[PDB]
Amino acid sequence: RSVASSKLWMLEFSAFLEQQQDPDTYNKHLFVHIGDPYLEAVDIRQIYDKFPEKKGGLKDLFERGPSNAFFLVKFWADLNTNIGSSFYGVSSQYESPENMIITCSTKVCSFGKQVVEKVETEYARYENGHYSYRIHRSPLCEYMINFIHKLKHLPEKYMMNSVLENFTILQVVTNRDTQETLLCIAYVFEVSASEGAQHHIYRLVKE
Amino acid sequence: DSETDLEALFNAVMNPKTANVPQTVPMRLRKLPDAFFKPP
Numbered sequence: 409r410s411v412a413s414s415k416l417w418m419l420e421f422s423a424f425l426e427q428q429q430d431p432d433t434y435n436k437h438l439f440v441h442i443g444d445p446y447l448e449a450v451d452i453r454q455i456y457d458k459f460p461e462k463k464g465g466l467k468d469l470f471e472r473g474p475s476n477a478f479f480l481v482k483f484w485a486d487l488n489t490n491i492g493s494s495f496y497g498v499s500s501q502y503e504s505p506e507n508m509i510i511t512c513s514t515k516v517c518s519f520g521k522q523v524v525e526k527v528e529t530e531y532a533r534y535e536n537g538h539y540s541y542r543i544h545r546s547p548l549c550e551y552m553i554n555f556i557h558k559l560k561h562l563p564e565k566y567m568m569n570s571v572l573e574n575f576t577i578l579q580v581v582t583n584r585d586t587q588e589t590l591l592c593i594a595y596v597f598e599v600s601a602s603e604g605a606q607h608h609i610y611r612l613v614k615e
Numbered sequence: 616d617s618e619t620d621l622e623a624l625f626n627a628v629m630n631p632k633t634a635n636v637p638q639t640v641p642m643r644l645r646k647l648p649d650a651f652f653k654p655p
């Protein structure tokens with residue numbers, strides 16, 4: 409359990425394109441996917457500029473804590489796919505010892521400025537001595553669909569990484585009633601070169 | 616101008632002579648883990 413605080417563990421995260429060939433035939437391409445130990449630490453100050461500032465921003469959230477809820481994920485995104493019959497989606501799954509109502513805020517940022525936010529509310533299901541939360545096939549917002557289209561139409565691969573330098577996603581999972589930060593995940597991106605999607609997961613620390 | 620301009624973001628890389636975006640420190644020049652740019 410890498411992306412895990414004391415109160416919530418994200419066991420699954422995937423962004424995908426599903427193409428319907430015919431009513432019984434689907435092709436799914438994963439752009440990125442995640443699916444106990446101590447992780448390498450990253451000085452959070454090294455990335456504050458890439459994420460929203462002010463009240464409710466990354467610094468404010470980190471300072472409010474708890475410190476063990478904050479993670480940095482470095483994705484290598486797989487863009488090698490055929491881009492009417494398309495569905496762009498994001499699926500995620502979480503586990504907690506606690507029965508909570510959770511809110512998941514996902515902010516897409518450019519040059520550390522918020523462009524779009526998706527906000528989802530999730531209720532618990534009891535499962536094998538714990539509580540499970542699932543965001544199932546959440547539609548990828550149009551901004552992200554547009555972004556992916558523009559990335560793929562770039563003539564060169566180095567151009568994609570250059571654009572991605574200033575594209576980030578901040579995911580904040582909160583207990584709706586208490587406002588406790590259960591998970592806060594900062595996402596940074598490069599394009600995958602080796603033929604698929606990969607990731608490194610880090611813990612965010614004060615220094 | 617607008618920092619969140621999607622067209623401007625891509626134009627800056629496609630047509631560098633007409634780039635009009637904030638200037639940033641590239642990630643590779645930052646104090647980050649050794650394998651941050653080396654995929655598993």
Ligand SMILES: *C(=O)CCCCCCCCCCCCC
Pocket residue numbers: 423439440485498514515516524525526547548549550551552556577597
């Ligand atoms: C719109 O609803 C914004 C929500 C973003 C969800 C995060 C999905 C991660 C996108 C994968 C990036 C691939 C592009 C390089």
